[PDB]
Each structure stands twice: as C-alpha cells, then as structure tokens.
DNA sequence: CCACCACGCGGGCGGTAGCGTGCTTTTTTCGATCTTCC
DNA sequence: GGAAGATCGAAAAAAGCACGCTACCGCCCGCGTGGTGG
RNA sequence: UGGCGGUAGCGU
C-alpha cells in the first residue's frame, strides 16, 4: 500500500498542473504568453535556446 | 500542386485504408519490412509496415477535399500540427522511398 | 450597419468565411464551402423540419 | 501503489479495471511506442 | 480440411461527415480605440 | 506624428451548485490472430 | 457483500 513505482519517460513531458492552472507558472517565469508556451510544448513552432 | 500528408490509420486496417485511398485516385505510401516469421511452422518472411499506423498520402486538396480523406472508412485521423494538417517535405518522401532498412 | 460591418463583399468570400467558421483548421475551397452550405440547410438527409 | 487502484473481482471470471489503470496503460504503451520508434530512426514528423 | 472457443494489444465514434445547443460568478486575455506624449 | 502605456469593453475559460438515507436498472474493453474438434 | 452512471422515493 505504500511502495510506489516509476516510469522512465522516453522524452521529457511538461506538468499539466503547473501549465494550465492560471496563472501559468511556466509562462509567468519565462516572460512569454501562454499561447506561445502551448505552441512550443505541443510541437507547433520552434523556440530558440 | 499535389502535396504529401501524414495519416494515422486505425489498428489492423492499414490495407483497407490503403485500398480505399487508392479508390479515390490518390498516391499512397507505406514502408514495408520483410521479417522472418513462423505462421504455423513455415519459414519465410512476412511484410510488416514500418512505423505502424502511419500512411503517406500524396493528393491535391482542390481535387478532393481533406475531410473526404479523413472519412475513407478506415483512416483514424490526420497527423495535424496546429489547426491545419501538417505538410511533409518532399525530401522526407524521397528518403522514405529510397530507405530499405 | 450590419452591411457596413461585414467585410465580405462577394458570394465566394462569404462561403469561405462560413466554411472557416463551421470547420476551422481545414483548407477553405469553393467546392467544399458550397457543398457544406447546400448540405447544411437545403439537404433533406441532414436538415429536416418536421 | 496497486492497492490504491485495486482490481475488485466481479465473480464472473473478469475484473473491474479502474480509471487509473487505464491511464497508466495508455502512458506505458505510448512510452514504449516512442522508444521503439526512436530506436528505429523514425523521421522527424513521426517522432514529433 | 473447415467451423468455432480463446487471446492480447491500441484508443472518439464512425464515416468516403458530423456530433454541441435553457447557469451564474470570477479571472484572464485580446482587439480596438485612444491618448498622450518627446 | 508614430510608438508605448491606458483602458475598456467584449469575449473566452474555469469552478460551484446542502445534508443524510432507501430501492431498482445497466455496466465494469473490441477485433485481427490462433489453435482445436466435428 | 466492490464500485460507478441513470431513474424513482423520504426527511428537511
């Protein structure tokens, strides 16, 4: 009842709780609108690093 | 004018979807891999579609619409990035055609 | 006033706008837009006032 | 933990799968498919 | 050699499209003015 | 005289909708693939 | 003897 498992994701995935819950923590931290974050997250537009 | 699109097909319906697309007079592409299989103890190679549930369809949206392709009785959906369906460059098509892994 | 506000000034533009509103995310073609408009209200199979 | 998402017997030879089990199965299947396609050198569009 | 009793993997469903459809309050965003200046 | 802050209303998205209790119904994954008996 | 969804009912 207490031992938990873990799954090693092939690629990193963003946390939905820290993304869609307004205000977006990731978007507020990165000084970019939520629309751009959603676009880059779901493979819609490249973002420069 | 004619362009390529990526299509996600239903499970176990790749051949039916391919035949339905061929009936619509569009170009269809799917990688084929020969892999040694058993099938009740006879030793040959079966054809398995590389990148399963993926089809590459060359057609013209003006000639026949996108939703018509989306509803060919066996096509699960379009591989769309954004509002509009994604466009695969011809270089990827050439790579897939020449590649025989 | 509604005519002034409306940007469309032709049947083709109106059909394209209607198709875009009805089915967003698809290439707006004249044949598809006219088929959708004629099948939405004036087709017995899809529209039927009892 | 499994007991947090138990499979209660249905006294008919079947089990009642919870929603969490279904979601975990979907995630595991997607991850395995992604790993297999990455190992196969899939094109960029398919990987994305 | 053919009918029928298991079986273990993907995903909206089904269809050569379209399906939704009688609440109110709070928070966020966005186009459009605007306006106010340096 | 154009650009940046204001703002302003209009639209879009998220969340809540009393407490206990009783009875009934329905359900608790499909389909191409495979082995076995008539 | 475990859950949900729907329906109906009781006390406010």
Swiss-Prot record, chain B:
UniProt feature coiled coil, ranges: none
Keyword hit for Transmembrane: no
Keywords: DNA-binding, Transcription, Transcription antitermination, Transcription regulation
Gene Ontology molecular function terms on file: bacterial-type RNA polymerase core enzyme binding; DNA binding; regulatory RNA binding; transcription antitermination factor activity, DNA binding; translation activator activity
GO BP annotations listed: DNA-templated transcription elongation; positive regulation of translation; transcription antitermination; transcription elongation-coupled chromatin remodeling
Superkingdom of this protein's organism: Bacteria
A GO cellular-component term linked to this record: cytosol
Keyword DNA-binding attached: yes
Effect of gene knockout: Inactivation results in increased initial adhesion and biofilm formation.
Function: Enhances distal genes transcription elongation in a specialized subset of operons that encode extracytoplasmic components. RfaH is recruited into a multi-component RNA polymerase complex by the ops element, which is a short conserved DNA sequence located downstream of the main promoter of these operons. Once bound, RfaH suppresses pausing and inhibits Rho-dependent and intrinsic termination at a subset of sites. Termination signals are bypassed, which allows complete synthesis of long RNA chains.
Quaternary context: Interacts with both the nontemplate DNA and the RNA polymerase (RNAP). Monomer in solution.
Record-stated family: Belongs to the RfaH family.
UniProt note: domains: The N-terminal domain contains a vast hydrophobic cavity that is buried by the C-terminal domain. This cavity may bind the RNAP and become unmasked only upon binding to the nontemplate DNA strand.
The protein's name in its UniProt record: Transcription antitermination protein RfaH
Organism: Escherichia coli (strain K12)
Record gene name: rfaH
From-to range in the entire protein, with total length: 1 to 101 of 162
Swiss-Prot record, chain C:
Protein origin, superkingdom: Bacteria
PTM note: Acetylated on several lysine residues in the presence of glucose.
Reported biotechnological use: Co-administration of salinamide and rifampicin or salinamide and myxopyronin suppresses the emergence of resistance to both antibiotics.
Family per similarity comment: Belongs to the RNA polymerase beta chain family.
Function: DNA-dependent RNA polymerase (RNAP) catalyzes the transcription of DNA into RNA using the four ribonucleoside triphosphates as substrates.
Subunit structure, interactors included: The RNAP catalytic core consists of 2 alpha, 1 beta, 1 beta' and 1 omega subunit. When a sigma factor is associated with the core the holoenzyme is formed, which can initiate transcription. The rRNA transcription and antitermination complex (rrnTAC) consists of RNAP, NusA, NusB, NusE (rpsJ), NusG, SubB, ribosomal protein S4, DNA and precursor rRNA; S4 is more flexible than other subunits. In pull-down experiments interacts with CedA.
Protein name in the entry: DNA-directed RNA polymerase subunit beta
Species: Escherichia coli (strain K12)
Complete-protein stretch covered: 349 to 398 of 1342
From Swiss-Prot, chain D:
Biotechnological relevance of this protein: Co-administration of salinamide and rifampicin or salinamide and myxopyronin suppresses the emergence of resistance to both antibiotics.
Superkingdom assignment: Bacteria
PTM text: Acetylated on several lysine residues in the presence of glucose.
Coiled-coil regions listed in the entry: none
Its job: DNA-dependent RNA polymerase (RNAP) catalyzes the transcription of DNA into RNA using the four ribonucleoside triphosphates as substrates.
Subunit structure: The RNAP catalytic core consists of 2 alpha, 1 beta, 1 beta' and 1 omega subunit. When a sigma factor is associated with the core the holoenzyme is formed, which can initiate transcription. The rRNA transcription and antitermination complex (rrnTAC) consists of RNAP, NusA, NusB, NusE (rpsJ), NusG, SubB, ribosomal protein S4, DNA and precursor rRNA; S4 is more flexible than other subunits.
Recorded family membership: Belongs to the RNA polymerase beta' chain family.
Name this polypeptide is given: DNA-directed RNA polymerase subunit beta'
Residues of the whole record sequence present: 246 to 293 of 1407
């Amino acid at each position: 009842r207490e031992r938990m498992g873990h799954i090693e994701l092939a690629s990193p995935t963003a946390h939905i709780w820290f993304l869609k819950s307004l205000p977006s923590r990731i978007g507020l931290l990165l000084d970019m609108p939520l629309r751009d974050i959603e676009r880059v997250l779901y493979f819609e537009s490249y973002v420069v690093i | 004018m004619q362009s390529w699109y990526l299509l996600y097909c239903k499970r176990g319906q790749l051949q039916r979807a391919q035949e339905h697309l061929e009936r619509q007079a569009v170009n269809c592409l799917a990688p084929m891999i020969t892999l040694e299989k058993i099938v009740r103890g006879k030793r040959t190679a079966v054809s398995e579609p590389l990148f399963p549930n993926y089809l590459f369809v060359e057609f013209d949206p003006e000639v026949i619409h996108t939703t018509t392709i989306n509803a060919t009785r066996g096509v699960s959906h379009f591989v769309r990035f954004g509002a509009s369906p994604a466009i695969v460059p011809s270089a990827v098509i050439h790579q897939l055609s020449v590649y025989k892994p | 006033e509604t005519l002034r506000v409306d940007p469309t000034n032709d049947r083709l533009s109106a059909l394209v706008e209607i198709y875009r509103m009805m089915r967003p995310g698809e290439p707006p073609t004249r044949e598809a837009a006219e088929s959708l408009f004629e099948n939405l209200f004036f087709s017995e199979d899809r529209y039927d006032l009892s | 933990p499994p007991d947090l998402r138990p499979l209660v017997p249905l006294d008919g030879g079947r089990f009642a799968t919870s929603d969490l089990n279904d979601l975990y199965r979907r995630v595991i299947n997607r991850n395995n498919r992604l790993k297999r396609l990455l190992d196969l050198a899939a094109p960029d569009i398919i990987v994305r």
